[PDB]
Amino acid sequence: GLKAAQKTLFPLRSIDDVVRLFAAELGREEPDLVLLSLVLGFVEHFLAVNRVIPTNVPELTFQPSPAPDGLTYFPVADLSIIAALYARFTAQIRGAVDLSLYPREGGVSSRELVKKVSDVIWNSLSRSYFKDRAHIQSLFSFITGTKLDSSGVAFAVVGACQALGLRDVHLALSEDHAWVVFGPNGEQTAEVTWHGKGNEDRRGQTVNAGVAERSWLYLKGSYMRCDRKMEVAFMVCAINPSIDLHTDSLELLQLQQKLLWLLYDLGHLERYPMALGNLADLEELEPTPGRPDPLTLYHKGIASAKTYYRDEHIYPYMYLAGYHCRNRNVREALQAWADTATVIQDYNYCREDEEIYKEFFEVANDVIPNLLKEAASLLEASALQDPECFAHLLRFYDGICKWEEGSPTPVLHVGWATFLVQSLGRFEGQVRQKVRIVSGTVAGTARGPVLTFQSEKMKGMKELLVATKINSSAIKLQLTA
Ligand SMILES: COC(=O)N[C@H]1CCC[C@@H]1[C@](CN1CCC1)(c1cccc(F)c1)C1CCN(CC2CN(c3ccc(S(=O)(=O)C4CN(C(=O)CCCN5CCCCC5)C4)cc3)C2)CC1
Numbered sequence: 001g002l003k004a005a006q007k008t009l010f011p012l013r014s015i016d017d018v019v020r021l022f023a024a025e026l027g028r029e030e031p032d033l034v035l036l037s038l039v040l041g042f043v044e045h046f047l048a049v050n051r052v053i054p055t056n057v058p059e060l061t062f063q064p065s066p067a068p069d070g071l072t073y074f075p076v077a078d079l080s081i082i083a084a085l086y087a088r089f090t091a092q093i094r095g096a097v098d099l100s101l102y103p104r105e106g107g108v109s110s111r112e113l114v115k116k117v118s119d120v121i122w123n124s125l126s127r128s129y130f131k132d133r134a135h136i137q138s139l140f141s142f143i144t145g146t147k148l149d150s151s152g153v154a155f156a157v158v159g160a161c162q163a164l165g166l167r168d169v170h171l172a173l174s175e176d177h178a179w180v181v182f183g184p185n186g187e188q189t190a191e192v193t194w195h196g197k198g199n200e201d202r203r204g205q206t207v208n209a210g211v212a213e214r215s216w217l218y219l220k221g222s223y224m225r226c227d228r229k230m231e232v233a234f235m236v237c238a239i240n241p242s243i244d245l246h247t248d249s250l251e252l253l254q255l256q257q258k259l260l261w262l263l264y265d266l267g268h269l270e271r272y273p274m275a276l277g278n279l280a281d282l283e284e285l286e287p288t289p290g291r292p293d294p295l296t297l298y299h300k301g302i303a304s305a306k307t308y309y310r311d312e313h314i315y316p317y318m319y320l321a322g323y324h325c326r327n328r329n330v331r332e333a334l335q336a337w338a339d340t341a342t343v344i345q346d347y348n349y350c351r352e353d354e355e356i357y358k359e360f361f362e363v364a365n366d367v368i369p370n371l372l373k374e375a376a377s378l379l380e381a382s383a384l385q386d387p388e389c390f391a392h393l394l395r396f397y398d399g400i401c402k403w404e405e406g407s408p409t410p411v412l413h414v415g416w417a418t419f420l421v422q423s424l425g426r427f428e429g430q431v432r433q434k435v436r437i438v439s440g441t442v443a444g445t446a447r448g449p450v451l452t453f454q455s456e457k458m459k460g461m462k463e464l465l466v467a468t469k470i471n472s473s474a475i476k477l478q479l480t481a
Helices: 015-026 033-049 079-096 111-124 139-145 150-163 208-212 216-221 228-237 250-265 273-285 294-308 315-326 330-344 351-379 387-404 414-424 456-466 472-480
Strands: 062-066 071-075 170-173 178-182 188-190
Touching: 015 033, 015 228, 015 250, 033 071, 033 079, 033 139, 033 150, 033 228, 033 250, 071 250, 079 111, 079 139, 079 150, 111 150, 111 178, 111 188, 139 150, 150 170, 150 178, 150 228, 170 228, 208 216, 216 351, 228 250, 228 273, 250 273, 273 294, 273 315, 294 315, 315 330, 315 351, 330 351, 330 387, 351 387, 351 414, 387 414, 387 456, 414 472, 456 472
Parallel strands: none
Antiparallel strands: 062 071, 170 178, 178 188
16 A cells, blocks of 8 residues: 555656655665556656647646756656556456465465466456567556566566565566566566567466576576565666657656666665666766766676676676677677677577577677778778787687587577678788687696687687688588588
């Protein structure tokens, strides 16, 4: 229910009023996910979904204020609008789940209870809508339009469980999928949403098969297990400032940035690597005085992945590579993509890993070839003269090759082979042979660049990659075999 401590902070007539609600809620023993998701969805609706201020709607008012280069109008989150939306969600869940039928073994939710709550959210959704549509992530979207994206359904099941008073059900997250964790120690797992485009319905099952398989989608079991504060962080990361393909809401960017600093300062981003990369992206767009630099924040994201998730996360390095690409730091961008491939090498490419395959396919066959092409234009009146860039390029391919080893389906095909030959060819013979590809002579210690290949394919290509005249057919045949 909504208490006085919550209601007295309403109405929210500004960005700072919304931040105050979140600061107050984060200080409570159990932060209300439903209320916080509704507010974000309400303000996102008028700031990005339908910016045209309604004429025939009374009660709904907008707050003018000075915009940094005339006026800007903020959707006033009235207590009556939000409280009615909140009451409608609560009434729906409580009315569909009869908790007397479920034996709560000392504050522990059964699989049967978690599956019923999942079935309630699932059966409420519209029969037909575009799944990759923007702004269908929040509880506002679930209540006003019965539309939720993939991870939105997972968050809604958690929100619904909290409303029923089930403190043991939590959000579980990988870098591309979401499920719930529950039980006496949070070691019980259940699928609650779909994943991919026509990849069946595994809803109600454990994530064991996905973890045992070594797919990137289940991160070999080193996935995030959210507490309530991390679920608030997820919801803030889930804010979509996109108005259209090329424009953003300056208010939603400013709101997500201020909310991410709030979460950061309380230490709730310490175990959320991708939130730190998101904050760093926001800081580069609009630096806030007294705060650390985007580079410091990207490295804090990598440090979190290393400390709490045994360095099995891809996107913290991808965020840093993104920064360096935008700023045209070729060496530092190639280094961060090679570090991404060093992580993926200990995974096996499975059916539902298309999201990360598409990411690697694009860097290896579009982004890197585009970078080295632009770098070659700059040489005609530098990074291509640096043997360290060449070693990063080879370590990157080494990771992709090793990733393919032990995989049920191939990674590298004829399409990759072409861009490897072209990318190798962008470095002169003298620069390429400065790299020492060694296996190591002695193991341990006693009281030009050097590179070691972890993959069979790059190892068998050793001499070809470094030869003055590139044997295209042989490099293509070995990469695709
Ligand atoms: C922090 O935010 C979140 O956690 N968001 C969550 C909340 C709601 C759900 C959302 C989401 C959504 N997914 C579902 C499909 C997308 C998610 C997370 C966990 C579980 C889950 F189910 C869903 C995530 C969204 C954020 N992504 C992370 C980002 C993708 N990524 C990224 C970074 C770099 C590259 S890159 O390949 O390096 C590339 C090339 N490069 C360049 O800059 C080129 C050179 C420059 N040049 C080019 C043009 C000329 C000038 C500049 C960028 C690619 C992707 C960062 C993860 C999934």
